[PDB]
Amino acid sequence: STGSATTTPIDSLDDAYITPVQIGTPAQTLNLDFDTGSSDLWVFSSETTASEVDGQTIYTPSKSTTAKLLSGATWSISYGDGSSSSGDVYTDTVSVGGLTVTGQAVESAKKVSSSFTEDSTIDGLLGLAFSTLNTVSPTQQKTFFDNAKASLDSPVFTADLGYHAPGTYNFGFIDTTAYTGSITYTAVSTKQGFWEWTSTGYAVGSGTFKSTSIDGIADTGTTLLYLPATVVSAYWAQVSGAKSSSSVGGYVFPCSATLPSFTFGVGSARIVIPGDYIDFGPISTGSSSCFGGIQSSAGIGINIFGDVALKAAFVVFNGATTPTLGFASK
């Protein structure tokens, strides 16, 4: 089997991407944030505290003939931006882009933090990291990909995110029309439960490439590119007036600037992020200070190749027995 679904930015800045997902019988379609940095599929639901729902579409398990309470199971997750959610668990039929998993754990939120409530366009998350990070207790549950894998034509999924445009998540096949040149594959460590890999270096604009190992994760659920302070300083030093602002919470730059590109290495290959992808616009409405899309990872504890980086590539998440990651230009 295979599946193919379009993923769409939630706003004009590509702050996140939503992908339609069919849950239950008859289908209930919710727009989920596909997140290769976590491993819980959770949804706004009929059980979510009413005051914490503000425009989201909810999953109602009592209206699904295939829903079954997973008795005794609970979940609770805290993300790296400080957001969180928790609740109980059902199993139900879940389909993405034509690909169907029966008996998928669907984690029903009883509580969500304010950032989730305030984002009316995101109806929940679909985790695509390794199942060892799944938070369901006392019986840990598998991701949608892990459940689908044996049925897929090939044990892979791909992320093809757009810049200010829709893109695609494919399951079970590599669309050879969706990228240019060849795909370069690189080793993955699953020791921390992430799609963790080591970039071979970077360049700023038209500058010379610096060969240096940068360990980080491929995380479709993180908006920005978070890299070591040394790397980030070298980037922003090429933008007149750019500075790190503790009051704003990162690097800002004059909105009048033309940003340089940023290149990262994948083995001997190179992925170029155009300067425009690094512009996240005014810090507040009407400001002439703009927020940068490359930020320091210092204090996070890991480097994160988020959407800013990933949307510059066609990315293969290879879930073969020895997992790997592939990157191609597009």
Task: List the catalytic residues.
Answer: 35, 199
Which residue is associated with the tokens 């990157």?
A: 327
Q: Are 294 and 278 within 8 A, CB to CB?
A: yes
Please provide the size of the chain in residues.
330
- Which helix H or strand E contains 77, and what residues bound it? strand 68-78
Pair 20, 7: CB distance under 8 Å: no
Amino acid at the residue 301: G
Reference 99, options 149, 48, 41, 158; nearest CA is 149
Residue 49's SS3 state is coil
Q: Under DSSP, is residue 59 helix (H, G, I), strand (E, B) or coil? A: strand
User: Do residues 200 and 211 touch, judged by C-beta distance below 8 A?
Assistant: yes
